Amino acid sequence: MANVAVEFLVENLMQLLRDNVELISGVKEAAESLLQDLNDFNAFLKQAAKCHINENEVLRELVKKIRTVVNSAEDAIDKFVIEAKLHKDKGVTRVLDLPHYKRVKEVAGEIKAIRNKVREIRQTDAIGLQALQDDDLSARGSEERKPPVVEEDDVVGFDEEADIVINRLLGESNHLEVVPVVGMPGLGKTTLANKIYKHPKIGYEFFTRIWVYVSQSYRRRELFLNIISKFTRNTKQYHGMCEEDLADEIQEFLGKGGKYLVVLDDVWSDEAWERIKIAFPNNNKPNRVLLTTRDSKVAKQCNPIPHDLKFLTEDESWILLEKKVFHKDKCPPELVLSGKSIAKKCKGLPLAIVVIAGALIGKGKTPREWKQVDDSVSEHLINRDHPENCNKLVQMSYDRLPYDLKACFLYCSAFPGGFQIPAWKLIRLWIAEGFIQYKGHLSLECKGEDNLNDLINRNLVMVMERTSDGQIKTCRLHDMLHEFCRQEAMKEENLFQEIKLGSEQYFPGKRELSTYRRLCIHSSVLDFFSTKPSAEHVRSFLSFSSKKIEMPSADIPTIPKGFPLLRVLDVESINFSRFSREFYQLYHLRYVAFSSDSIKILPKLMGELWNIQTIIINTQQRTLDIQANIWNMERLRHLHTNSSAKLPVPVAPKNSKVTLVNQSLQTLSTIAPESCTEEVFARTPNLKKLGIRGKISVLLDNKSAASLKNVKRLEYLENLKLINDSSIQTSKLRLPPAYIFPTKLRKLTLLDTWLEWKDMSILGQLEHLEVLKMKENGFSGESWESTGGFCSLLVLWIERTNLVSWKASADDFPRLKHLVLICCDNLKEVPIALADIRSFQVMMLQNSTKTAAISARQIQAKKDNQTQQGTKNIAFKLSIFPPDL
Amino acid sequence: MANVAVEFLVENLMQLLRDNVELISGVKEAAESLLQDLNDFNAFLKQAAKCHINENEVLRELVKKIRTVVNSAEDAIDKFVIEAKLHKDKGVTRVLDLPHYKRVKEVAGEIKAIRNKVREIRQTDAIGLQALQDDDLSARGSEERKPPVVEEDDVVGFDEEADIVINRLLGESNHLEVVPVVGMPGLGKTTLANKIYKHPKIGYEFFTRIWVYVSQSYRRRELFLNIISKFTRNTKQYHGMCEEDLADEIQEFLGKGGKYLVVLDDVWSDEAWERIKIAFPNNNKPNRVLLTTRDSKVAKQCNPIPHDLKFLTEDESWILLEKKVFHKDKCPPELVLSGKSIAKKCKGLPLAIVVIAGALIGKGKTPREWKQVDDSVSEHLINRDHPENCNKLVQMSYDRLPYDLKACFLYCSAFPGGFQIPAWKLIRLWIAEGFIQYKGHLSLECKGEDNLNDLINRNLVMVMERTSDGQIKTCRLHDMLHEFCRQEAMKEENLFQEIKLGSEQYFPGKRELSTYRRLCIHSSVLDFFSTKPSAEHVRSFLSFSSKKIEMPSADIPTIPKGFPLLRVLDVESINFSRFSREFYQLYHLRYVAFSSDSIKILPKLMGELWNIQTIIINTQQRTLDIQANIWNMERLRHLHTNSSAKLPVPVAPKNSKVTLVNQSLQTLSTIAPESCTEEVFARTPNLKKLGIRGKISVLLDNKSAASLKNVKRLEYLENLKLINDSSIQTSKLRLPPAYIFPTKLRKLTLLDTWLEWKDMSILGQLEHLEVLKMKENGFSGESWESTGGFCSLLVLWIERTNLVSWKASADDFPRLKHLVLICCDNLKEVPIALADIRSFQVMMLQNSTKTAAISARQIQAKKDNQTQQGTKNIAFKLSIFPPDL
Ligand SMILES: O=P(O)(O)O[C@H]1[C@@H](OP(=O)(O)O)[C@@H](OP(=O)(O)O)[C@@H](OP(=O)(O)O)[C@@H](OP(=O)(O)O)[C@@H]1OP(=O)(O)O
Ligand SMILES: O=P(O)(O)O[C@H]1[C@H](OP(=O)(O)O)[C@@H](OP(=O)(O)O)[C@H](OP(=O)(O)O)[C@@H](OP(=O)(O)O)[C@H]1OP(=O)(O)O
Ligand SMILES: Nc1ncnc2c1ncn2[C@@H]1O[C@H](COP(=O)(O)OP(=O)(O)O)[C@@H](O)[C@H]1O
Ligand SMILES: Nc1ncnc2c1ncn2[C@@H]1O[C@H](COP(=O)(O)OP(=O)(O)O)[C@@H](O)[C@H]1O
């Protein structure tokens, strides 16, 4: 939508005028003029949006060229800004910088012609404003939306295929067999196969169970490395071994672990199965493979008997729609006939019905909306076999979205097919692109999380992984939605364009690449950069690859010089050895991610990019030294890192009264303990997440820095992590008293502190802490005895400890819901008093002593009797690692 | 509740341990013990609150003797803190200074005996936990509450008595006659009388109309000063007059305004009417006065025929109940029988029904709750005429309130009966008393406002005046609610104690005062301070008088020396010549208000008080100079003033890296223009309100306009005020461009800037501004022509300008709701296009030309025609203050 670009340009111009007067100084009148005209433009596009522009040709004619004239302005202003900052570097103290001030004033001549153009067009727009304001529709207020807790996890009317499949498997002893499943896209082969892979009988039967996704763009060796990973810890060794030997190693590991069930998803080409099957050892055991698909030929080839999936009958259809649109509550009677007619209109496709329930949630729950939706569906599914019917249905759902979500959905279609989207990165990309604008009081990140939850609710985006906290950790887009969104973006809106290279084709020429605004290259990238492209109007550049590619020493300069107007640059999948000066000459850079293996210092010139919001760095060295004045970069909001970062020593200005305290700074992913000082925390009042890697001892000792005591100043801090990199128990470490920590702290992580279990009382004293995660021998001992305090703790996580005896009472953990016990191969039993807590719902116990498993089964039987006893308890689910136990 | 005191002590001790380590260095061990013990008792009392406490004597014994212990600990800790801070001022560098640290360390010995007693209680209270694990009631989640828009403005079934009285009045023209009304308290005499005083016929008949609330606590001379103020512009002439001459002057002015209707409310004693009546000139006019009362005797005395009021019948009863509990929606059928049974039991009392509707909102909308409240209301209204039948019903409603709202509702009875509570001050007092504890993300002020709205919703608190923008401005409690709350506080909770000098009340001795925790003296207070009281354990002190009382030069030491442990101190009704040296040793002072007439400097000693949150200074000087280090005091949240305040020049610590940036500061009432600087605005990031009184020229001068340009830096600023004191139009003033102002600014006020009307284009560009108030010739000119831009402006307020011509179109102000036009004595036209704006609903026009009134009547006719045309328009109310216009 043109509104997005208009708003972003207005905001950036305002920020540049307020903040940096000197750069814009030669053209201030033109800046203010463009500001007024863009405000008026935005109002006009809103008024046009109120109407159905597609209904009138004149309205559609009017919108065109609103966007091009706006685009011409953005270009001229940005070129001017970069030119004048280069002038500042020139340091021409001449009063009249006649040489090359006439170049920045050539850009200003373009600016002036552009201001003249914008003054025009605005006069024509004033014509037809009154006529447009005569008409309006959908005059209503805005309501709230609510978080997407799990709902309808049960699968309507699909027990039949589940039981048939679970029956078929385990037929012939000592045979490696494959179970094909087919059925048109959106039917639910993955959903049913998930229900199988999570049915109790399957987990009872086979010990090893691997979930594997194999699309068309799948890679064989990438898959083998990960499957070997399922068994062992490190794959960096097998980065240097052949696929065949890798196939052999997977075979040995998989054969060792008794039986095995392996799931490969959405296969496309029979040769794909032919190649992948090698790793599986046919060692004369009843091991079952479960592949699903869409094409019939491959299913038939891999086994002469494919099990075809089934459509949902009319009743299943209506019940499913009722569930999705009305969630737990039951439908009010008046809409029943409408909903049943729509369900019948669907023909029993779970995908069409699901998206339609999303559209109904979007419209409302009033009879007029239901009748209109019924009429529209009765029109857009006249055929069955044509997939574009699903596209028409999704378009109908899509039309009702707010334009802000319209931008986010398309931009979520940017990622490659089959790629699992990291939610935090997706939110930060949305922020840096300008799709989320200040409205209200929520922090930008919270608004982004709410937007993602909204998109999940109407069933456009399917969630894949969730956190311990219950939040979302990784999402993606179903194939049909990906195709519809990609076509809509690359064709209509020109949001972005992709450059995947088919056989016997060439990367476009400079004239074509001239008309792009964003690039995505998810295929051979070094090949596009060996050509030395040049497109002055590329603002973003995305490359979400699978492997890590090295960048040749003679090829580093190409990105900075080819695209001198970047804003977003995510090349996390490309490893750099260094950087060139043109890099530090990129002055519009907002988002910047990159990897590296020999980087140790963040050069100081990097602090001259005065618009950076986000920074993400990967480095193999333990210590990363930062020399750029991050206290100078006003708008910095995040600084991620995987090594231990050594922040610079802060100094306030001497001749300037102004103090350097960043109000908008929310993260310091991993800083060294040496910098956990009073001043570092004086400068970050609003900090919400902090991490410290290094030798946690320096913190805990009270000589060098009362560092844990320094932590008291961060009032809003809500997440902390203590990572120790020393591998030597030089002394014993002691946590300070529980009045030093912040009050809202909600999630803590320890790793190799090696603390004594008596200190757990201090943590019990904390009030709001909701998740405790101690990994890799965080607390050392053999005797912990609960002493109360964990009033609100919701998830407990213990991994790689030598604890033996634990003792508690049902009043120690009143709100427990989740309990994680990993790699505790020296614990004996879990206290049974944990079976008394009502909310205790999920437990898991990995690589643990079998006596603990027997006690856990006792606890499960206890809670089963409780729920049987008429209490309104939440259902009980257990998990014990041993297949036998 | 004991919970609130427990929590406040815990929080204060935590803050003391964190920030001031040295003060509590000698006792930190007892301090930490006590801190853990107080957390344990907080949890204990929560569990006790789960099980019913009112009904059980064992519980009401157990809870006692914990409060005594916490109070003893509080007193010991506070005495320790004061003596140790005096030790800091002593500056004894001796390693071992026994004198006055032996007595301080034996104050720590008292602390140690108290910690021992707390340990004993800890051991004892653990006994008796077994029963608490058994019992728990009202286990449920918390939902949201919504802001109080007007509900049931219309009065159910009262129209008939309004008819009788409106018909009754005006019968014998040319006579001064009083109209009494009688009907038991809580029946609605003032509701009906307000309905009359706002009936169109009344305003049409009489020109002048006055509202004057009266009560037993009335004061005549104040009444007249108020009665004459309503007519006059300057009260200076009448201030030094005699009460009889006050009567004379009110007589003359009341005669000037032709006829008149005067309303006097809740007259108690005939002597009152006899003493008041002289001021009314019985000038042989058809003038009317309206009295209402709860007593028959005085009503008979005033006139031999009082019109006794009626009770609501059953239908009106149930109608009122459904209205109050369901607002604009209709009751679900199942609850109809219950609601009607309750309404019938209520006998027809509007107050009983209103309170029961409030209780029903509080509980829920489910049949079990309705049956419960029904079976309880049948139980508590056995008698009829008697008042206590009402008190019991309030008890039923009040029982369900959260323990947080119970404290605030009780604390609202501190104010003397018949006092209109200033809402902002009330919220600030609640904050300083610790009643509102940080919960969530809302600012403390927002949480307080929400709490007040909640209290209003249940119909416990009656609103009196609202602001321009629709918010609350002052409130009060109905008499019976005040009596119930007063007894409940003074007797059961010992929340506070009043000392009302009756004809036979005489000031308690030192022993009795040894037991109070808070005082309220709303009577002669100089008389109480002539006695030189002494009570170490008084924490608050409140005196909300109506007059201003000057403090004798010999009694300024009495407040500090008598009460050396003060926390809150509101004596805004007592003028101070100066402050004695003990004021600067009230180190616990959080809230401090006072007045003055000769103060010009806040001496630097004031900055030594490290806990001050709020400061209110009401000085008659034109300029107030501040020398206390505002940047040193860390918890400062507000600073209110009358004179152009001249803040000190900021300085950073030379030898310390610390930066003096207050995150909590949120107000500066009237700063001097000279101090507005980037140095100051750098220190106050979250500032939300700013005011600048002085010579606005320095600001608005484009050459020195760097001032408002500095104002550009406050991101969250939401309210700004420009007040000019100079009476000389020395030059013409121009607003800087609209990209300098913050983006969220919602309300602007100008006063004597004398700006050209062409500049209103700048203010049009601002997007979110919702209320514009220009007073006392803000914008000067004779020709303003609207140029669009006021996208979201809701109220327009023009006062005392020589504008003559105004031109606009219905697209100029799309969202206007209320238009205020006062003292515009030279306007000739009100563009008719304002009648095409649907949002426009209330209009006003005061001291304006007749042609404007004609145009306004045409506008009302137009909107009436529109609403007649089937459009869903919000009903239109027009008002011209002088009816003959
Ligand atoms: O807050 P309000 O209830 O709306 O009172 C406002 C205003 O207050 P704000 O602009 O800060 O909101 C002023 O009250 P104070 O700020 O001084 O406390 C005062 O006008 P001045 O700026 O000239 O002081 C005037 O109240 P009053 O009529 O008692 O003088 C006015 O009243 P409104 O409520 O009608 O806006
Ligand atoms: O499950 P989560 O709720 O995501 O919690 C953590 C955490 O994530 P958050 O701090 O954002 O909540 C870590 O995030 P990052 O370190 O990448 O910033 C991540 O990595 P760490 O191991 O270093 O904590 C870790 O993932 P994992 O432990 O698997 O590596 C993950 O916990 P999960 O195990 O559930 O992913
Ligand atoms: N039996 C079912 N009941 C309700 N919804 C279903 C069912 N089966 C699939 N879905 C819906 O279909 C989507 C899952 O996609 P899916 O059909 O498994 O992809 P494919 O079948 O193409 O591999 C989800 O939105 C899910 O809610
Ligand atoms: N029909 C009604 N008559 C009188 N009061 C009503 C009615 N409906 C609601 N109320 C509410 O009852 C409250 C108490 O009445 P009020 O007029 O204060 O008592 P009184 O006039 O007897 O002192 C008022 O705030 C009013 O809003």
Residue numbers in the entry:
A (entry chain E), B (entry chain A): 1 to 885
Give excerpts from the publication.
Unlike most NLRs, the plant NLR required for cell death 2 (NRC2) belongs to a small NLR group characterized by constitutively high expression without self-activation. Using cryo-electron microscopy (cryo-EM), we performed structural analyses and found that SlNRC2 adopts an inactive conformation in both the dimeric and oligomeric states. Structural comparison shows that SlNRC2 dimerization and oligomerization act to stabilize the inactive conformation.
In addition to dimers, the 2D averaging also indicated the presence of a small percentage of tetrameric SlNRC2. Further analysis was then conducted on a subset of 611,661 particles for the dimer and 159,294 particles for the tetramer, resulting in a cryo-EM density map with resolutions of 2.84 and 3.17 Å, respectively. One lateral side of the LRR domain of SlNRC2A′ contacts the coiled-coil domain of SlNRC2B. This interaction can serve to stabilize the coiled-coil domain which is not well defined in the dimeric SlNRC2. The carbonyl oxygen of SlNRC2A′ Thr743 hydrogen bonds to SlNRC2B Arg18. The symmetrical packing of the LRR domains of SlNRC2B and SlNRC2A′ further enhances the interaction of the two SlNRC2 dimers. The stacking of two loop-out regions dominantly contributes to the symmetrical interaction around this interface. In addition, SlNRC2 oligomerization may lead to sequestration of the signalling coiled-coil domain, which is disordered in dimeric SlNRC2.
